[PDB]
């Protein structure tokens, strides 16, 4: 609830809400000062008879510093200077109340980014894109909306306590019989509405992951679906969220429209009826009615805007929130990597015990064993679907084993030492994204450029007869996802993307699956001249590709084994 | 900049438009009424002697049909009716106002996916994906709420105008005398505010295009991301962003709370000013010293608000509008397709004369000729990159040639007739985007389910003793794009939505490159035995795949010619 919004805003999020509760009862006292000192000097005009009677309005002509004209300028000046210092402070608080509110973007996207990026490969693998783009980016953004609307409830509610107390100390009847009054108005405006809106938000939280689900899958088959010509059902499906969405959010703002509409009705309906009422039998009368009425309808129309703002605060608290601060809630406690330590790899890398499986499933291998020392260059091949990149991505920092270890020169890999260990793969996934800019960049991975060893590995992936003959050269963009290229090509970047890293370990997994067997000749021959320092480790279906592998295990519906 | 607006709305809404400018002239009329007739109704309380001076109030206390205490009655009930309708006409104006303003995203967002999903190809492969995603919803969602601020600018100007109306009969020099303070006031805020606004805009809309970027590509390279251990540089980028567009957002907040601040100030100011003005040398001695103060700051107190309304609404119109309105008048301005006459395939399948270049590019063909019978099932073999599945992506419907035909059955394929001539191709793609839900799905894309059909194709598809063994079986979901299978079983399922779609034309293009040579053997010797009433083009860089195709041919530099 708030325990929820307390665990989200960080440690010093909390400290800015407490100081903004401090500026915002202080702002509450001087907007009540403003719209208290308005009578006073609103009352030395007409009548300057006010300085002849009431026992705390008489005592400041005693003083008689100034004849009679003279009060009104030492009057005037500090009420607008007063004035001029209010404007300003209002000024500062709003621009707080906007740093805090929509800096919170900020302040909790790149938070969410980094849960995301930090866990575990296959707690990412059962994740979903979309759902992950719609929480950093439009479910923060409530978030921030809903930041501010909280904000503003708590500094109307002070504003609204202090106010309380003012018309308390003064004709205490009329305050208290109207607080019940206004409190009860309230309880029916939440009671009767708020059900709707916590529906509306559910539905509109909902409609949402649903259509960028739909966006984002549809766009990635974008040419199948130009194919089977059912562009329209894509949009159909579409056009179904989107009505969702809208619906919920015209429901919201015509809801959030009807708090100020009731006020008006009711209180302008009441105070017609008490005056009819007080026509022929009247609880006050000559200068009792004046004041009754007078302080009445002032403190009635400065109460009004500010319960307005008290009931649409609460209803959005209602909408966003609840539908959409678990959203967060639930995005903060994941399973997250962690440590430091460093590893060393000279010798050899035992796989011993390893045993895996999914988080639910059945195991693919279960106490298999294998050894891999320094240099030995490897090839796993098996039948579709037995799992090789499965153990390839055991072997490698992802994917933590359920019963063996994988040990490093015979040391444990484990979550202590992972990362610099990760450090040490080239990969080329057999699927690769390539993401749209230079052919420089993605070989990079921004990381630095060595223009000489740029150069080689174009050399050593035979792309520099690709790049040379492109009109912008290494420079040339590569369009979304490597759309703009072919598959030989995205390929030969992908092993180039590798081959940048440096090596210690270098994985293959089908790199030669889109170039031809020529090609692919002189992209081995190019490596294995190079990989003689390093171990290195290939999966391909076909073979030719292992005709250098010296060792070639073959994986069955039990563990693995050699063979030549 | 409103031409735009007017692109955007469809003949309907802007007839919409024209009635809620209508409804809003009305509830503004009504919204007058209201304050208007309460003044002379509080006019009747502690003195009730203006019912016997001012000639427009003296004409009606001897009508003699009622006393005169029983007058008050009456309109007392008019006071309680009236003021019930105008809260059920706003509740009623502010619905409409809600359901256009927030309905847009519906209306506008459908129309924007439709327009992207019916662009040729190629044209699509020149778009950034993420861009997409944020132009149809993060675009769409800040068109909605500042097509709501438009109308407001409109409503607000038009019952200021009425307002100053009637100002301009009741007292007359001090309507003039606020009305130049004013609008001098609301000019000097506009053009000190608009530029900060203009600039903070731009840089938020800059702020989310590249924002999303990062957030879809680095999201697409996850795996790559954390096997480089440059899993927060990432987050860096992103931090960069994030806090730009906050910044952003808390300068359009920050000042749209300027203009309400300033008004209130200077207007309290105003009052205490004329009133000091007042006291030593008036202007009007024993009359007007209350009734040009009363009506004046009564109706300042009307002015103020819609005064800061009109401002601040003209200002969220430069802040969002110029950021994206301008983002979808050139997003509905974009090359779609067409089509709808028939092709019939019956016996031959020509290409004659085919030139093509991507659309800026040097040409890869240039009158190449082929003709292709019925049946006849070619295949295509080159180097990786000289363009071959470019050739498949021209006999297929996608992608126009430059200067060729491409004739089915002696008749020109163009796009009068690719609709129905894309429906006779099953695709089969290189890299294989499966959507994350049932395995039946995928295969079936969405039309229903047919059985027969279904277990037909998996079983053609050799993947039957996959979805054997499977828990759910042909129910388990597929994992995001594919991510929770194998490649190979990616490929079988993707063979199986080439094969469920019906023949007339097989494409492979490697379909059959992330399979072993044993289950390529099976797949295509399932395929072989029914392609021989349709026709079918391999791609594939491996032999042994064309082992029974017919005629190969072999791209080069030149043209293609044939290969035996
Ligand atoms: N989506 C695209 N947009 C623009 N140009 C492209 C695109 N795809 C390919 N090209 C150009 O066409 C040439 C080869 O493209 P492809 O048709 O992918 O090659 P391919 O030989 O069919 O695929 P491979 O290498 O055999 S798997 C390249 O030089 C590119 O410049
Ligand atoms: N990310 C994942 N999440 C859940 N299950 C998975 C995932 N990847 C693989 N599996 C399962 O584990 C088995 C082995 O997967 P892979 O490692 O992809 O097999 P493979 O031997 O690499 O296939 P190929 O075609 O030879 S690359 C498959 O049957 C999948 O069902
Ligand atoms: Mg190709």
Same mark, same amino acid.
């Given at each position: 609830?708030?325990?929820?919004?307390?665990?989200?805003?960080?440690? @010093?999020?909390?400290?800015?809400?407490?100081?903004?509760? *401090?500026?915002?009862?202080?702002?509450?006292?001087?907007? #009540?000062?403003?719209?208290?000192?308005?009578?006073?000097?609103?009352?030395?005009?007409?009548?300057?008879?006010?300085? /002849?009677?009431?026992?705390?309005?008489?005592?400041?002509?005693?003083?008689?510093?100034?004849?009679?004209?003279?009060?009104?300028?030492?009057?005037?000046?500090?009420?607008? *200077?007063?004035?001029?210092?209010?404007?300003?402070?209002?000024?500062?608080?709003?621009?707080?109340?906007?740093?805090?509110?929509?800096?919170?973007?900020?302040?909790?996207?790149?938070?969410?980014?980094?849960?995301?990026?930090?866990?575990?490969?296959?707690?990412?693998?059962?994740?979903?894109?979309?759902?992950?783009?719609?929480?950093?980016?439009?479910?923060?953004?409530?978030?921030?909306?809903?930041?501010?609307?909280?904000?503003?409830?708590?500094?109307?509610?002070? *504003?609204?306590?202090?106010?309380?107390?003012?018309?308390?100390?003064?004709?205490?009847?009329?305050?208290?019989? !109207?607080?019940?009054?206004?409190?009860?108005?309230?309880?029916?405006?939440?009671?009767?509405?708020?059900?709707?809106?916590?529906?509306?938000?559910?539905?509109?939280?909902?409609?949402?992951?649903?259509?960028?689900?739909?966006?984002? #899958?549809?766009?990635?088959?974008?040419?199948?679906?130009?194919?089977? #010509?059912?562009?329209?059902?894509?949009?159909?499906?579409?056009? &179904?969220?989107?009505?969702?969405?809208?619906?919920?959010?015209?429901?919201? @703002?015509?809801?959030?429209?009807?708090?100020?509409?009731?006020?008006?009705?009711?209180?302008?309906?009441?105070?017609?009826?008490?005056?009819?009422?007080?026509?022929?039998?009247?609880?006050?009368?000559?200068?009792?009615?004046?004041?009754?009425?007078?302080?009445?309808?002032?403190?009635?129309?400065?109460?009004?805007?500010?319960?307005?703002?008290?009931? #649409?605060?609460?209803? /959005?608290?209602?909408?966003?929130?609840?539908?959409?601060?678990?959203?967060?809630?639930?995005?903060?406690?994941?399973? %997250?990597?962690?440590?430091?330590?460093?590893?060393?790899?000279?010798?050899?890398?035992?796989?011993?015990?390893?045993?895996?499986?999914?988080?639910?499933?059945?195991?693919?291998?279960?106490?298999?064993?294998?050894?891999?020392?320094?240099?030995?260059?490897?090839?796993?091949?098996? %039948?579709?679907?037995?799992?090789?990149?499965?153990?390839?991505?055991?072997?490698?920092?992802?994917?933590?084993?359920?019963?063996?270890?994988?040990?490093?020169?015979?040391?444990?890999?484990?979550?202590?030492?992972?990362?610099?260990?990760?450090?040490?793969?080239?990969?080329?996934?057999?699927?690769?994204?390539?993401?749209?800019?230079?052919?420089?960049?993605?070989?990079?991975?921004? /990381?630095?450029?060595? @223009?000489?060893?740029?150069?080689?590995?174009?050399?050593?992936?035979? !792309?520099?007869?690709?790049?040379?003959?492109?009109?912008?050269?290494?420079?040339?963009?590569?369009?979304?996802?490597?759309?703009?290229?072919?598959?030989?090509?995205?390929?030969?970047?992908?092993?180039?993307?590798?081959?940048?890293?440096?090596?210690?370990?270098?994985?293959?997994?089908?790199?030669?699956?889109?170039? /031809?067997?020529?090609?692919? &000749?002189?992209?081995?021959?190019?490596?294995?001249?190079?990989?003689?320092?390093?171990?290195?480790?290939?999966?391909?279906?076909?073979?030719?590709?292992?005709?250098?592998?010296?060792?070639?295990?073959?994986?069955?519906?039990?563990?693995?084994?050699?063979?030549?």
């Amino acid at each position: 609830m708030v325990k929820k919004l307390f665990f989200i805003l960080s440690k @010093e999020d909390k400290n800015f809400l407490f100081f903004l509760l *401090v500026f915002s009862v202080f702002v509450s006292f001087i907007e #009540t000062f403003a719209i208290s000192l308005v009578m006073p000097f609103i009352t030395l005009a007409s009548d300057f008879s006010y300085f /002849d009677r009431n026992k705390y309005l008489i005592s400041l002509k005693e003083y008689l510093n100034i004849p009679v004209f003279e009060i009104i300028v030492y009057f005037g000046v500090g009420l607008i *200077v007063f004035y001029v210092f209010r404007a300003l402070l209002n000024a500062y608080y709003f621009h707080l109340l906007a740093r805090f509110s929509k800096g919170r973007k900020h302040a909790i996207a790149y938070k969410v980014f980094s849960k995301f990026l930090n866990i575990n490969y296959e707690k990412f693998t059962q994740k979903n894109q979309s759902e992950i783009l719609k929480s950093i980016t439009g479910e923060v953004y409530n978030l921030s909306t809903m930041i501010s609307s909280f904000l503003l409830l708590m500094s109307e509610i002070f *504003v609204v306590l202090l106010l309380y107390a003012l018309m308390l100390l003064i004709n205490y009847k009329i305050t208290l019989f !109207l607080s019940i009054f206004m409190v009860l108005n309230a309880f029916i405006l939440v009671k009767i509405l708020s059900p709707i809106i916590k529906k509306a938000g559910l539905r509109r939280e909902e409609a949402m992951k649903n259509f960028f689900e739909i966006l984002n #899958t549809n766009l990635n088959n974008f040419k199948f679906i130009k194919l089977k #010509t059912k562009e329209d059902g894509v949009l159909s499906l579409f056009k &179904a969220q989107s009505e969702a969405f809208s619906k919920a959010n015209i429901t919201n @703002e015509s809801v959030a429209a009807v708090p100020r509409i009731y006020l008006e009705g009711i209180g302008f309906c009441v105070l017609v009826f008490i005056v009819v009422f007080l026509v022929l039998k009247n609880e006050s009368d000559i200068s009792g009615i004046l004041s009754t009425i007078s302080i009445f309808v002032l403190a009635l129309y400065r109460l009004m805007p500010s319960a307005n703002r008290i009931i #649409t605060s609460y209803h /959005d608290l209602l909408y966003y929130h609840s539908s959409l601060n678990i959203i967060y809630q639930n995005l903060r406690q994941e399973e %997250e990597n962690a440590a430091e330590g460093k590893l060393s790899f000279n010798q050899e890398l035992k796989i011993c015990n390893l045993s895996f499986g999914y988080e639910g499933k059945k195991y693919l291998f279960k106490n298999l064993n294998l050894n891999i020392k320094k240099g030995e260059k490897i090839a796993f091949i098996g %039948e579709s679907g037995c799992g090789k990149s499965t153990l390839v991505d055991l072997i490698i920092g992802l994917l933590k084993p359920k019963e063996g270890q994988i040990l490093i020169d015979k040391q444990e890999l484990n979550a202590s030492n992972a990362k610099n260990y990760r450090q040490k793969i080239g990969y080329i996934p057999q699927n690769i994204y390539l993401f749209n800019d230079s052919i420089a960049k993605n070989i990079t991975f921004g /990381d630095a450029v060595d @223009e000489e060893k740029l150069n080689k590995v174009i050399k050593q992936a035979n !792309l520099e007869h690709f790049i040379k003959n492109l009109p912008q050269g290494v420079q040339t963009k590569v369009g979304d996802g490597g759309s703009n290229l072919s598959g030989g090509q995205k390929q030969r970047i992908a092993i180039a993307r590798a081959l940048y890293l440096e090596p210690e370990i270098l994985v293959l997994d089908q790199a030669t699956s889109a170039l /031809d067997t020529q090609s692919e &000749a002189k992209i081995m021959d190019e490596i294995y001249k190079i990989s003689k320092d390093k171990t290195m480790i290939i999966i391909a279906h076909r073979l030719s590709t292992i005709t250098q592998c010296d060792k070639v295990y073959r994986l069955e519906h039990g563990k693995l084994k050699e063979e030549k």
